[PDB]
Renin
Amino acid sequence: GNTTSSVILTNYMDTQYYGEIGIGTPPQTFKVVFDTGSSNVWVPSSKCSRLYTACVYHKLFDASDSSSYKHNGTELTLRYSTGTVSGFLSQDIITVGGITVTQMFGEVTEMPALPFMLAEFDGVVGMGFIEQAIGRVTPIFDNIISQGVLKEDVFSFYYNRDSENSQSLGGQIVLGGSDPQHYEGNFHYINLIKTGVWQIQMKGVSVGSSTLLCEDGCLALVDTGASYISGSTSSIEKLMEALGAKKRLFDYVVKCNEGPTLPDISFHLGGKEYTLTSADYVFQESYSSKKLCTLAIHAMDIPPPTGPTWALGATFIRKFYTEFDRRNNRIGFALAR
Amino acid sequence: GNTTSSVILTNYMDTQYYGEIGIGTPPQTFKVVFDTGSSNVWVPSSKCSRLYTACVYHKLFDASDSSSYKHNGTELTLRYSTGTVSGFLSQDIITVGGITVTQMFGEVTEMPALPFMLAEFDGVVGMGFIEQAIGRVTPIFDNIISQGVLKEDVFSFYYNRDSENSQSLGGQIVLGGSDPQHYEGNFHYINLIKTGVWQIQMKGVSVGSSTLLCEDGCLALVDTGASYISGSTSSIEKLMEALGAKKRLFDYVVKCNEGPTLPDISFHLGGKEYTLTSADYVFQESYSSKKLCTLAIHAMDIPPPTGPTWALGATFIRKFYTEFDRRNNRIGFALAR
Amino acid sequence: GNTTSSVILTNYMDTQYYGEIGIGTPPQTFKVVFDTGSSNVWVPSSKCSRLYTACVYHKLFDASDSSSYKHNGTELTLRYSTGTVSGFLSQDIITVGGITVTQMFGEVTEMPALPFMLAEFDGVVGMGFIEQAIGRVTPIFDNIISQGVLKEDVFSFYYNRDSENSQSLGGQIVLGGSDPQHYEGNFHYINLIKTGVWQIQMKGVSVGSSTLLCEDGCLALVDTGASYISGSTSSIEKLMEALGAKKRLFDYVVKCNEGPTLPDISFHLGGKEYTLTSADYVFQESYSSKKLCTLAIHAMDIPPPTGPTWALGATFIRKFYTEFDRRNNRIGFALAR
Amino acid sequence: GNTTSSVILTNYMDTQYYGEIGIGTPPQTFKVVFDTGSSNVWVPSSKCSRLYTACVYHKLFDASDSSSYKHNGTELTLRYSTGTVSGFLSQDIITVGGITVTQMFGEVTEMPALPFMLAEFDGVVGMGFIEQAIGRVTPIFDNIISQGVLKEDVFSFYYNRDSENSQSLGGQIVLGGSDPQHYEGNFHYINLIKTGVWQIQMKGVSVGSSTLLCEDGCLALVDTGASYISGSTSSIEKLMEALGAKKRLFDYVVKCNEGPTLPDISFHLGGKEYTLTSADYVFQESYSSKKLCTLAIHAMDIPPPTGPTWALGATFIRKFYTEFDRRNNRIGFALAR
Amino acid sequence: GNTTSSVILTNYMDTQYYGEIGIGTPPQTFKVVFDTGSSNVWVPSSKCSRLYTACVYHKLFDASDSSSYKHNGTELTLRYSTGTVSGFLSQDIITVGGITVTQMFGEVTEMPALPFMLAEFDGVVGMGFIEQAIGRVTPIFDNIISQGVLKEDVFSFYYNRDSENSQSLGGQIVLGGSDPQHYEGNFHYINLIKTGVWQIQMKGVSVGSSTLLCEDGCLALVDTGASYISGSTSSIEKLMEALGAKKRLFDYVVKCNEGPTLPDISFHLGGKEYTLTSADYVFQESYSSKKLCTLAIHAMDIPPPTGPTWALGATFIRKFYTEFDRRNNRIGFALAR
Amino acid sequence: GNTTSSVILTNYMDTQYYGEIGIGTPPQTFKVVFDTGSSNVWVPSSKCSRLYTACVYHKLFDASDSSSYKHNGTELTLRYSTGTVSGFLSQDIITVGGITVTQMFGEVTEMPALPFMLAEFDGVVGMGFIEQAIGRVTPIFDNIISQGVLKEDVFSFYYNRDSENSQSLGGQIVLGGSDPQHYEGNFHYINLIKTGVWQIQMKGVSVGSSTLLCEDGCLALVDTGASYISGSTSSIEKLMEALGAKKRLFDYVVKCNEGPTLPDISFHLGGKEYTLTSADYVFQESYSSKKLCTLAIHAMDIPPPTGPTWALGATFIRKFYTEFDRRNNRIGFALAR
């Protein structure tokens, strides 16, 4: 085919990027994260008990109002690194940037206050492979490919820096290609270890003038649905010792004055070193020594079979425009602009 | 009749106002919000699972200790804009400022951590109409009227500013009239759209030198149980654009230095303009440009049938002593003092 | 009569105190300072040209929009110790906390950026005497006494300490009496040197253990429209030498840790000693040995006839609740609170 | 017997002290609090629904991986002052500082987000008496005594101050004796009211130069599992009035500048006055008057039969090395170092 | 050609702007300031002795690790208005936001602590002309024009205001064009006095309502490598007298509350008036009457031939987006945003 | 003997270090500074008249309430470099971290507000020699050596850096030895010029690269009771000129951003160079280019016989752990930590 579609994304405190989708007839709209680390679509349901306060604070899909609804009802539970949702499968029409696709999704009826009350978004649109689809449900991108309308069998992510401006675009997902207006230089590609996961070989991680981590190679999950760059607890302990960062419950911090002079961190991928400066990974909220500044690098032990692995989320993608190539099973990176 | 009673209220961070009631024989006491936006009485129950941490941190009604208790047991679920509680109905004797009334109330056994762990109060005394009573339970004020002891069929709210002083009264509810010691000038009255809800016509909302909102009239719910003044998401977006406020997850903020010079907001009700200054709607916690200050105006989409509507909570009532007149179905306002 | 009327006041940084008046049918609402150190009422005009950038940033009165406006047009200039305004005389209903009074006042058309860009208030309500009113315009309080509605022929001021951790009342003016909530004990009065100015005899100002200033007496204006306790340049020079304070560049300062070592300052007024501690006169913006802190006492050379005199502004009034007694031409003080 | 074992503890923000234990074959490790205020062992279970986000963020015991596991399955619910957990009993081998003991513990399958998401620890090792054991399960210390290997039938707690250093030990529990390297002077002992609870008579509590609390004697629970020193709501109101502290939802605060000069608090136990200075009970996070500082003394109404009682947690134990003597039923205190 | 290339810039405290370049095969990545006020490229060397403590704390280039390095060794000294570096000439591939260009540059071996310990950047990329290049080394932009890839023969600078409440972009340089996202309206250009320096004629500098400086004209360097607007010592002395500013010890200051009373400063350039308001030129680090605030205008006596001249640095560029037009030997300015 | 005894110390703002002693049977507990620069013990008395406002705000000793008090009554005056106390001699049991010793000390009855209102401690424990004890009262350490309980005849001081983000130990004094936890490596000792004062020969003070002060030698008192490193007025004048520091009003300051450019200060003591970096001697209260920062070095003209001399106070001791060796009349230093 010959079309491409983009969805404009909103950027929330540099930790959540989401766009809009419509479900049903007439469309009921939802803020959703386009997530390469999962493969299911779900949104909160009108059948979700209001004793789930997260459901009181989000848009709820109501099937009783949709003339295009198709019942299925199979239970499913979706497990993420920072929380779990549960509900049941339904089918309806979903619009994503002017593509209309019939799609099986989850109507979530159990949505925990922690963390979903901290979600600006309502739901999730998984962009992973069917291999990782819970309930063996066909993912939305596979369904869009079937239609034979996308110019290429790929999608791309631009994640902007946060703005205080209204007229700064938070991000952009292009279905069927890439926007050259938001990257420069050439794409450089790495092949997936295996089809089924957006995960690649990483040859090394260095902090300053030393490959002190991933010395014998390791795994990098490229996860548009993760806020941060994460690694294993023990990998991160080492990294954070070297930065002189202190561990809290959920994050690491440094004294704010120390932030700007923290060293570079490089990620060795497919023969190119991908390099973040301090400004790229420190929430420089102040310059005061009497204050604490969060780092956009966390600990997360992703379990087998996907893990143990590093994850390269928004912290990484803000620097590097990312293209997900399904036809050739590879990820490409280019300097974002 | 000829009596009136008042209940002294405590003011918590200007967002929660509550007084004491006694339930049972001997009395088991509870901190409760007197709430014109709902019509049921409830308090937390001894039957509430301690897996509900909100129940571990509040006073629990225990029916086994009350010789005046009368079982009913009908389930009920109470839905508020910021959360839900659930339990079952019971009857017992309730004292409110020296009035003793036999009252059906809810013993809540499901009380979500978010938001009820943020409640300084234990329960709620709904002061709305039977028309909005869940379970068609007679509300406490209707039951008090039946006794034929109140001088007038009205109640009134004084909500003070917050104090660092002990000896500042947080607020006052007068059952059966008004305290002229806490208002000045004359009351000015608006008739309810309909008996059944404490909701009136609002002719316009202006921000500075411009009626930019509610240009063709809209609805104002007068809600002693809401912290803030709220309006529809789209009404508020407009208001907040004009103030130069930025939206966060739950609130809007401005830079603190900008607070004092923010413009007036007026609310056109029954032929009088009701005007708040910045000091009335900004939590001026600092004057620093490197800090964020919350506004006591929020977004809340109240659904049909009551909504879509604005709500005029504590932010408004601190400025304006409010009388609720059931005999003549109207709300009156006067400058608080 | 048997009424009083109160206006709640905003405190800006302990240097500006102001509240709401209404002008016109229907009311246009302005922030004003209630100023016992002048005798005219004025607000900025719609006719104020946009050149003066202080008029773009303050609420403007619009005669065309008031059915009770009555033209006068007479020119007038108002000279304060810090800044001068010119404009013309207008008439209308001014509303001040429940009282409605017909009043002549200034529509200010010349509003110098220096200092009125610093003014958080729009205008000024002069509580001084007719003897000092420019244009011999009957001052507002005189006009309100003529109504015969006020219980006593006095008015009172409470100014509060500024607080970042509470949204307390910044202050209160009570027309027609006093509020026992904001003082303790009983008033002791000092008679005016003469009707016409709120000015009393002072019999000494001591610093710790020695009446080292104003032996042989001096004058004290009690000025609710002034931020500070002022004395003459020479007076304050000697006051600061006694305290160990030094001219930074613009203001006098102390090392913040040494503030609590500074001696009590005592103003001998009508037989009694009125004492401010260092906490009451130094802005303990911080307490460290590494910072400097300013004082709430400044040099002000007031010219004849009113000066040379001390002025007792906000600083003093914060400590001592003040009643201005027009019937008896005296001033009452009582502590706190 | 002749052995003693110690477990090194980690100190988290001075509010949680925990060490490591191993459960199962091969060992599955867990961070646990050694808690004299309870008598059960539990850790989170692999059977805990991932809709409990607290279970997503902690180490989960998985019985399917343990060749030493012994099923029992009896339900149990453990109620603490700040929350509840629920699950069922299992038996397995537990290692604590080189002692290996077969132990019945709780596999928790219900673990509320509030407060368990704020737990750095995974589980709890109750060190109380069988008398208070839920399910009449033999506590771990009783089981260790049975082995006849401990030199003395006692255990001891050292709780360090918090450090920014890695190489500062957070705390230490000695099984079978005391470490003289972490105390000085002599132990001074008080007998338990009764065997069954780590609770003693307290003869008085003084704040400054006045026994204003516990004037006629009261109860002190010595609780290694509580963060703070607590007393009854009414006892604490009085204490906090005297310190000039303000009550918030969960804690009390003072202005930070006021912290260092707050008076001493003494606790009269078995004929010695145990004295904390401000530095011992104030989280001195800043010296600024524009900031709030938490006190490590809270309100908690412990119910019958253990209560009403004061609790002496970490705030007290940091100052005083504590020995728990089971053979002679007593608690001993000595100055920590 | 038809390409542009952009480099995203970090803003440190509104006084240092810098971004990423790569040098060598494979790239070694350094932070650099893009400096229209000089014409050489340099980074610190591996050969830089560890004595100069500024070399221990900055990224060092290592020729031995680059397969595209080509020795030159020629000595060179670079004199800035604040500090001097010496070193030797090297050649390699420098990569600048998607463009790869072969370039001669300085390996700096002498790096004085004063001021380079204060330097958040490693090195400097000179965007000035060959006429002013030490050693007559072809400047990087000239070398990039020679590739014939850039769409136009210009480059542009956006410098942003620093913000603690957002992780916004600190700035952007676009090689080969301009980004309409960061200005509004259209450029107006001023021609260079002569090819060779980014220096234009200035026809007046007014303070409010009077061209009181630079009547009879003066020179203005537009210097992206300077923190401030500078003028000559005498010029700035008279500028500060007009503003009411005073020499603290090192810098000129105003009382923070009086900043908003300061007059607009206007630079008459090419027929148009370029105006900074007080918000644009004063560091409102705070707004209180109790604090002093510094200005973003400093005295700098630049020596011949380039000086004596005004310099328009970051302060100016923050207000006016700047395009440097090499084809036409002129400079474009447009507002904001 | 074979014991040591330690007292944990509170750090107030890096300028006052003090801990707990007990006096009387039963103990009355006072905060004291452990002062190697004086030789008497004193606390404030119950007999101290309430005039001296410093006595109302400090713990007072009450002889009437101690069964081990033994009257002496002899008058004594104690002159420190900053302030003077007078009072009378008393005897009692003083308890100091596990040691009980009978001691003669001062009951202070005259306690000048200047400077003792600034004193966070109640009293002083003189660790100097009998030769300098007013009234030739045996100093406390001598009395403790006479017990023959201490393992070695020395005592040691650890002073910590102040921290807002941790409740760390502020310091530690060890009587009878040293704590390897708070230094690294091994002590190197400097012999006393003579028994009787904790004063050593200094062979030079260099600023960066030049012994520009104290060539031809000078004296150094090692004073645990002084906040700073002091030198003579002339000495410090030349020291500050070399650093670029200037007299603000009261203290010397640097621009906070320029602190890290200041040279190492090195004190040549007993053959070795003891070096403080700028981090160790400047109070980096902030790091901005818009703020000024004070130094922890001050001018102090000490009079004969003890002076003129440098004093090495808290500033020095923070860097170098200090052991005072009474057996060998020398002082040991080791780094950190």
